[PDB]
Ligand binder design. Structure first.
Ligand SMILES: *[C@@H]1O[C@H](CO)[C@@H](O)[C@H](O)[C@H]1NC(C)=O
Length: 246
């Protein structure tokens, strides 16, 4: 398990949490020196538990699939909550069995569906450590509409920060003031699977991508990533989705 406490949190302690998150995901290979996540994992070892504590010391426990860093569900007090998707129903066979009831949320976990449920795109939702503290608090008491927005915050501040150093830095910039994500942030999120694929295809292609990846950069301009000499590859992405899962 890994843990993060918002009480007394600062950029450093958040850094230590994102480091622990990355370190808790198993891999046997690196590709261009980036951890390659496993194709699969059977049983309860598929899932990592993150204990998150809000400023007042109340906690939720979040279950994460270690093969793709997807949030499956969470436990808050004696109630479990899982996305409405087959992967989360499967996870419910292994985690939080001890819950007194199990609620299935009325959406799946994908960005599109969560934004519909929340009533807004994540271009308009501020993130940062204060937003994370709010999200933990929202998730303590069921309200599905409010939960959608909180899960957009939670996903971005945990999983997406684990995947990209740039996003981790963005959250560290927002330790004491929330701000909506940069377009660069949105772009990376949206490209994780594509990048993960093209970095893997690059291995027998002289480090050259088969298909370019289009990103928005830190200045707002759209750019093409064509090979592993790009900073995105050398100095940003921290985890690769296995092509077996793409
Ligand atoms: C590889 O990527 C860099 C940008 O990081 C670019 O300058 C270079 O032209 C690219 N080369 C090929 C062969 O795709």
């Amino acid at each position: 398990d890994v843990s993060f406490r918002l009480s007394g949190a600062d950029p450093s302690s958040y850094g230590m949490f994102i480091k622990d998150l990355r370190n808790a995901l198993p891999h046997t290979e690196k590709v261009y020196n980036i951890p390659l996540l496993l194709p699969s994992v059977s049983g309860a070892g598929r899932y990592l538990l993150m204990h998150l504590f809000n400023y007042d010391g109340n906690t939720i426990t979040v279950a994460v699939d270690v093969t793709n860093v997807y949030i499956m569900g969470y436990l808050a007090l004696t109630t479990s909550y899982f996305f409405n998707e087959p992967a989360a129903d499967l996870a419910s066979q292994y985690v939080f069995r001890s819950a007194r009831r199990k609620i299935t949320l009325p959406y799946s976990g994908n960005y599109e569906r969560l934004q519909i449920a929340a009533g807004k795109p994540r271009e308009k939702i501020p993130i940062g450590l204060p937003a994370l503290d709010t999200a933990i608090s929202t998730l303590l008491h069921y309200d599905s509409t409010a939960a959608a927005g909180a899960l957009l915050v939670l996903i971005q501040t945990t999983a997406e920060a684990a995947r990209f150093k740039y996003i981790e830095q963005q959250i560290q910039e927002r330790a004491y003031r929330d701000e909506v994500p940069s377009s660069a942030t949105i772009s990376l999120e949206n490209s994780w699977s594509g990048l993960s694929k093209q970095i893997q295809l690059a291995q027998g292609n002289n480090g050259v991508f088969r298909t370019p990846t289009v990103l928005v950069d830190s200045k707002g301009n759209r750019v093409q990533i064509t090979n592993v000499t790009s900073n995105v590859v050398t100095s940003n992405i921290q985890l690769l989705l296995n092509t077996k899962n793409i």
